[PDB]
C-alpha cells in the first residue's frame, strides 16, 4: 500500500519543521512561531495535495 509510504513521507515533512525553542522573550518566540507557521503552511498545502490523490473524490 503506497498510501502508507505517502503518509510516512508526510510525517517526515512535518518533522523536518521542528518546534521553536520555548525559552526566550515573549515576542521573540512570537516571531519564532510566526516563521514556523509559514513553513507548516507550505507543508500543509503539499501534504493535503498528496493525500487528496489517494482519498479525494
Amino acid at each position, epitope marked *: 500500500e503506497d498510501l502508507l*509510504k505517502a503518509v510516512r513521507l508526510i510525517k517526515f515533512l512535518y518533522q523536518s519543521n521542528p518546534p521553536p525553542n520555548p525559552e526566550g522573550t515573549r515576542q521573540a518566540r512570537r516571531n519564532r512561531r510566526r516563521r514556523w507557521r509559514e513553513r507548516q503552511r507550505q507543508i500543509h498545502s503539499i501534504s493535503e495535495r498528496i493525500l487528496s490523490t489517494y482519498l479525494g473524490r
Partner: antibody
Amino acid sequence: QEQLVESGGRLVTPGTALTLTCKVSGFSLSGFWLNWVRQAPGKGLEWVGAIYRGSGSEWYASWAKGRFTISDTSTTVTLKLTSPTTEDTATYFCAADTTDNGYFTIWGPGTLVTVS
Amino acid sequence: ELVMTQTPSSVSEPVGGTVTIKCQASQSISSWLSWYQQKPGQPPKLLIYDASNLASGVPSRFMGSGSGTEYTLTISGVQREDAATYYCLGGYPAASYRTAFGGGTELEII
C-alpha cells in the same frame, strides 16, 4: 550554489547491473525531491523515479518498479539498474525539485549508457 | 498511471506567429503541470511551473493555461532560439498517479 553532476555511463552487455551516481552540491535544503529522468537517443523524456533525500522514501513509475533502485548517501544519490536491456540504452539526467511542488528547477548535464 | 498526451507533435511557424501546444492529462492534476524546453545536446530547462507561472530567467513571450485537464503552452512572438523540443510534466512523485512526461513537441523556425 545548486549544481548536479552525474557519472557512471558505460557500454555493457544486457543483464549487467549498472550504477549511475549523482553528486549533489550547493543545496541549502534539508530535504528535496531528487529525480531520475531518462531519454533514449532521438526520443523523448521519460521519468524514471524520484527519492526524498532525508527519508527512505523512493518512488518509481509503473514500468520501472523493481528494475531500478534509487539510494541516498550523505553526498551521493545512486540509480541502480539491476537488469538492463537494450531498451534501457539512453541518456540519464538527475533533476532537482527544491520547492517540493513537483517541478524540476536544476538538472545535471546528463550521462550516456549503451547496452548491447 | 498518469499519461500526458501532447497533441501537436511537430509545429513549424514563420517568425512572429503564435504557436499553441496542448497537453491532456489522464487524471486531474490541478496545479501540478510544468512546461520544459530542451535543445539538442543539452539538458532541459524550466519554462512554466504551477501551470500559469513563468519561471525566472525566461522571456515573457511564453504563456500557459490550465483548463480542467486541458493545459496549454502559448508562444506569441516566436524567435529562432525557440527551435527546440518542448515537454509538459505533470503529477507528483508521491501521488498515486506518479509524475509523467508528455510525448514531446518539436519547434523549428523557418
